[PDB]
Amino acid sequence: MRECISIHVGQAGVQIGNACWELYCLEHGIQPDGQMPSDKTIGGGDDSFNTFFSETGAGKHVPRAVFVDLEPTVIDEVRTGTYRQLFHPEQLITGKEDAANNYARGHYTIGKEIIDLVLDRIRKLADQCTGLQGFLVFHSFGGGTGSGFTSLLMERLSVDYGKKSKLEFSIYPAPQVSTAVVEPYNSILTTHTTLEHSDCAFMVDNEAIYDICRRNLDIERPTYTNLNRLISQIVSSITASLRFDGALNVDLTEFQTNLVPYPRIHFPLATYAPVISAEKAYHEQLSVAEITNACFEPANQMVKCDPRHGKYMACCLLYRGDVVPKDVNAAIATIKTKRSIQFVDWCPTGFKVGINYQPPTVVPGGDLAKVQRAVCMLSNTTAIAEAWARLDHKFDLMYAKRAFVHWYVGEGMEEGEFSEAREDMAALEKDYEEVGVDSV
Amino acid sequence: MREIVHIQAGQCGNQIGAKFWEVISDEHGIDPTGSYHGDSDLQLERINVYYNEATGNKYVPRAILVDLEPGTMDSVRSGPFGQIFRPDNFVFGQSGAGNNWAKGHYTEGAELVDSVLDVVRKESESCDCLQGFQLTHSLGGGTGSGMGTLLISKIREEYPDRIMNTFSVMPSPKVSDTVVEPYNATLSVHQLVENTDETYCIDNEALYDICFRTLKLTTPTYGDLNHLVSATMSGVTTCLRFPGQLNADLRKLAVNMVPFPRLHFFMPGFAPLTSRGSQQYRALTVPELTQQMFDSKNMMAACDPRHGRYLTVAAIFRGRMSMKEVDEQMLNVQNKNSSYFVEWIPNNVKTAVCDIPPRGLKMSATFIGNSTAIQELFKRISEQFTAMFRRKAFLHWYTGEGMDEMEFTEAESNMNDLVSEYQQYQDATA
Ligand SMILES: CC[C@H](C)[C@@H]([C@@H](CC(=O)N1CCC[C@H]1[C@H](OC)[C@@H](C)C(=O)N[C@H](C)[C@@H](O)c1ccccc1)OC)N(C)C(=O)[C@@H](NC(=O)[C@@H](NC)C(C)C)C(C)C
Ligand SMILES: Nc1nc2c(ncn2[C@@H]2O[C@H](COP(=O)(O)OP(=O)(O)OP(=O)(O)O)[C@@H](O)[C@H]2O)c(=O)[nH]1
Ligand SMILES: Nc1nc2c(ncn2[C@@H]2O[C@H](COP(=O)(O)OP(=O)(O)O)[C@@H](O)[C@H]2O)c(=O)[nH]1
Ligand SMILES: [Ca+2]
Ligand SMILES: [Mg+2]
Ligand SMILES: [Mg+2]
Fold this sequence. Notes:
The structure is cut from a larger assembly and holds chains A (440 residues) and B (430 residues). With 440 residues, chain A is α/β, with parallel strands linked by helices.
């Protein structure tokens, strides 16, 4: 019951999936061959970790996950890597030719050749569930597959599963690690196409993560491996309420109720603490009060933007580890005194809090210190729209000269789809302005 | 043998419902296995009001446990008194209601409600002379609030001449950060105004403030809150459960307490206020009980009774005490504060005394007020409702289940009308 199916799309989605599933295995005590000695029910069960793992008669715990990419070389590393036994081969799906950083190839020319096979494999996972809750979809904004195939997939999932919930983890581009000049086009196209199909989307700004790795972990030039280990901790924080239970645990769906006041306003800002190196964490106790305060420091946000220049519509705190109610209540009291957190006039101001007692885990060879307690704040702030404005501006610069547009038109797209997508983004920015205005 | 059928719905409903059954089972000398082991005939004389008899002289609560998710009921079945309940009377789904009144009332709850009514019917058929129903639920969630009021309406259709009584837990931002609770509560109050005979307004705002201010609990828990609720539920059902003259059944209570059909929302109070395991050694005097039971600080609804007027009052004293002193003190409250009792309902305060004290106390007193000050509670909910509704905020969760905005407007209008009707009788002169 309450199963969640994860779908990892394109290089970024797949590589982040690697990092997340490895971390989940460590958190639950699952070996790379999928055995879990602590699990006494063989071949099934309804424990909390079963929302994310099915089981075979032979004791294997198998991710409820599909990996899909339009070329094989990234998923091939999964197929031959450390966790190769973890996945059934049919969960790992590849084509031969990728989308070449072109939304149109991912959604149409190339994506159309594999979409039916992908849905068939998702259906096999869905059939195993006794109460499927929804999907978690991981993908880049910038890549041709991450943008175009994800959009196609989300549209097809709405048809095949109706309003079954679909959440996204979406990688927002940064120039330090970007690989295509047309990423703003792909970003706007996929955000427009997916908007009415997604219930909640957590944007992960690669520049924010890049900065945190440089500044907090003293990593000179972060790699995708550095970025993805940090990202996976944030994803783990957010999915922890689904995978563990405890008296103080609050389900992700309850946070979602508070976080989404209108269907289109569904992009929470995540902020995570503590991000600290072993060297600096040694002989340093980071209290509940300290990690909570860090949630309101924009340096720790997953998306670059300034909530102090915006208004809040909701604030959720997701704690894990050695965290007791009295300390959380005292920390929030302090914050409400010292920080001006301004809410819109039509929302209550109380923070919604969940606590999971299982402490954070780290993967061997990482740069993150292992800590006794951590927190992820999820906030609904008008400031998140800053991220749209930056992308929309880059789109506008190129589109005004129709730069690169012929690559899309040559694959069957029309200029009307570009302008329609950009107009939807203009309307989204206007929606975020409007919810911030005081009531009459 | 005037039977009451008890229903408890949703998380809050089952939590306080289970505590109610623990508390009154102990009072009646019934152990977790259903065996009687008490020392007084007073304990069994009206035991059939709340319990069925089995063979082996087992006593089984006439209780139906309802939820749209299994968690709380699994908790209950694994609690101390889990075995006492009739296993077939556990009626539950798997989907949950996601704190959503529409899911409880219209979609998820609708799929489960016939199963519940089947159990209700089996219990009612077994009754020598059924009085009516009591329901425990919160108004702020989805199952207790939405499915609870759905059940109330369906039961009224099948049993239209029976009394419907609820213990209804009102939401407060002091205790919950779920943003949609004022929507759920307003939709529910609309249902309660129309379909219950008596509703005890159990306010989480008041419960929290008693724990924090008076009991000096710095981090109140639901356990602490529910300790107050189960003390109150024990006190207000005492006249139903033990031999007595006054308010001895649900209908006689309603006729004494409800002068106009919509104004049937009661402010309960209790003295002495205690925390769990405080275990205090000095009994209160009759004057102390009387002063404290009428005090604002002892009310289970966060309303200042000095801001309104009492339409009607029931007071229940428990323990061995002088009935002469009780009468004297009760008269003193009325004669000393006569302006707070409407003058156009003569002798509107009734007093009962029961010899059997609650567990852990030598002396206690329970207050039931029909006060116009209860409008403050509905005003509080209404303000929270309108702050969101003026921007149609969070409505998509409800319209996604098939609801229209018009239904919200009608519920809001009905509750604002209720508020205005209290004010009307507050200002009314003889
Ligand atoms: C004031 C709001 C409730 C009352 C408290 C309470 C919840 C509780 O009691 N909870 C969470 C189920 C577990 C329960 C208690 O453990 C803590 C156990 C011992 C219990 O009282 N169990 C009783 C006996 C049991 O019948 C029971 C009842 C209801 C539900 C589950 C179990 O924990 C302090 N809560 C959420 C809090 O204090 C939380 N703080 C807030 O929500 C604050 N806003 C961020 C405000 C509202 C106080 C902190 C945990 C962050
Ligand atoms: N955080 C993170 N970002 C990545 C990773 N891999 C790629 N990206 C980002 O994703 C965008 C490029 O899209 P990719 O996911 O590589 O492309 P794809 O989805 O495989 O699509 P095609 O290769 O065009 O078929 C750029 O913004 C990259 O910085 C990763 O492992 N981690
Ligand atoms: N006093 C009290 N309030 C509760 C308890 N459990 C939940 N609540 C309150 O009930 C409301 C949420 O409703 P709940 O019963 O949990 O939802 P349901 O399961 O959908 O009916 C909130 O206002 C909570 O503060 C409890 O055990 N005691
Ligand atoms: Ca198992
Ligand atoms: Mg690729
Ligand atoms: Mg609940």
